[model samples]
Target chain A: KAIVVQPKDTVDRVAKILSRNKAGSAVVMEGDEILGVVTERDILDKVVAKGKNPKEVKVEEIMTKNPVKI
Target chain B: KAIVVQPKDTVDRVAKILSRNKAGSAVVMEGDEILGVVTERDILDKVVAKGKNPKEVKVEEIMTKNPVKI
Candidate 1:
């Protein structure tokens, strides 16, 4: 579950990572600490809902920030 | 990521499993498919918030059912 992505990575790239990992979400990070979470839910809701081009959008644009732990 | 737990397990037991696996959550399952997800947040919120004894409460009592996958 340590599959973290950079902010500059495209949504299309993120989609490939998700497909490769076969996971619902991937943690977005700068180094070791988590910054946000990019889930399939985020992709569908944000990109698809707004009719934004997934190929153009960065994963950071739609990632859910500060994923709740408690 | 396929760490599955039985419904009858105690919170204390589940906590041990989480620690051993170094995971914040475990999927509760009956067979190969998932029934729900028991997360650290769920344990803290549902069990701790209710003042229920972690040793006494079962994992099923606090698990999030039908986790949205989108």
Candidate 2:
């Protein structure tokens, strides 16, 4: 697990959260079900380069998602 | 070792090299000397947040360095 973002936070907040912790990525969660994750890689690729404002975007959306049935 | 940057290169070039390789940091190297390294973490912290242009800046400068002798 990367740094865990306790609840749904924005990208701006996530940036500070991740950077301050010196953590590579952050896993967003509350309890039981884990929401998603975000690495600086994701921010650079998706948010910034995508021209999305960090403040308006939620970390839940910026986070990487994985779901599978096997 | 991180992804290795063969020689002195700009941040713009390094970004493509790292992202394409799916590598976090890249170690700049030549002959027997190791130059430096850059994880996506560095690009965000030192480059973007610092308000520097990637095309004009060298990845070697943006990279993390350590001098350990004890």
Candidate 3:
């Protein structure tokens, strides 16, 4: 089962959840709407490696939009 | 740079390295030879979810062989 996160969730918080759950990705949810998916790669490349503050970066900003479900 | 591990490496050891590095995956290597890639999903689905003994499971046994490099 995949972990789900709110779109407003901070990248840092999502990262913590992912690490805690040992999940590679999380689906972003807003009410009943599905926003996108955030993967470890997205956080690493968009926030950590780029020196962007994850606490300030929203999941919607870095999440892969309309990710295909398999 | 992608983290690399040996084929003979235990899944427990690989998981530790992945968590410590905050990486999604690792390439299984033997000197100059590339064996396969092991991802978080692989470990979760193949080891944790299945209740397999990570210390007894070899990385090569669960790694995705010749994974597409993109």
Candidate 4:
């Protein structure tokens, strides 16, 4: 699923894609390369759970950078 | 949090860890190495979403096999 986004993409946009695709995570990419994944839980924990305004935060700021994956 | 589990672990066991830790995902590991991640969404989308019995499913079966990393 190329439901990827750029770092500058708004959290609302990413959230919308996550909801629309019925997916939990969206990989952030620049051009053809991947940066990291932003999961729904990441958003919930880092943004909502922390009581931060989701509308104001950027995806790059909240996303787990260089997420360890296999 | 060494909430990591082996791929052979039962879904019930994994489910417990996720609940207990209040985490959405658990990193599946073989010894010290990560194999894949089994997220709450994975269960929701793969097993539950497909109407498969969670009790009968294994972590490895439902987890995204060979997930990409940063």
Model 3 residue B46 CA deviation in Å: 12
Among the numbered candidates, top lDDT falls to 3
Q: How much is the lDDT of residue A44 in candidate 4?
A: 76
TM-score of chain A of 1: 0.80
- 10 residues in a row with least lDDT, candidate 1 chain A: A61-70
Can you tell me which runs of candidate 4 are displaced by over 4 Å?
A: A1-70, B67-70
Please provide, for model 1 over A1-70, each residue's C-alpha lDDT reduced to its tens digit, 9 standing for 90 to 100.
2245787788888877777766555556666544455566667789878899889998878764432354
- For candidate 4, what is the lDDT? 0.65
Score residue B40 of candidate 2 by CA lDDT: 74
Residue pairs clashing in model 1 are none
Which pairs of residues clash in candidate 2, taking residues 3 or more apart in a chain or in different chains?
A: B25-B38
TM-score for each of the candidates: 0.49, 0.52, 0.52, 0.48
Candidate 2 lDDT by residue in tens digits, B1-70: 3677765677667777777677777787776677666777787777654555555667778766635313
Instruction: List DockQ for all candidates.
Output: 0.10, 0.12, 0.09, 0.06
lDDT of 2 at B8: 69
List of clashing residue pairs for candidate 3: none
True contacts kept of each: 0.01, 0.06, 0.00, 0.00
What is candidate 4's lDDT per residue for A1-70, written digit by digit as tens?
Answer: 2255787787888888767765546656567644445666667789888988878888878654431244
- Residue runs of model 1 more than 4 Å from their true location after superposition: A1-70, B66-70
Model 2 C-alpha lDDT per residue in residues A28-70, reported as the tens digit of each score: 8878778777788787777654545556667788676777658
DockQ ranking of the models? 2, 1, 3, 4
- Name the weakest run of 10 consecutive residues (lDDT summed) in model 2 chain B: B61-70
Ten contiguous residues minimizing lDDT sum, candidate 3 chain A: A61-70
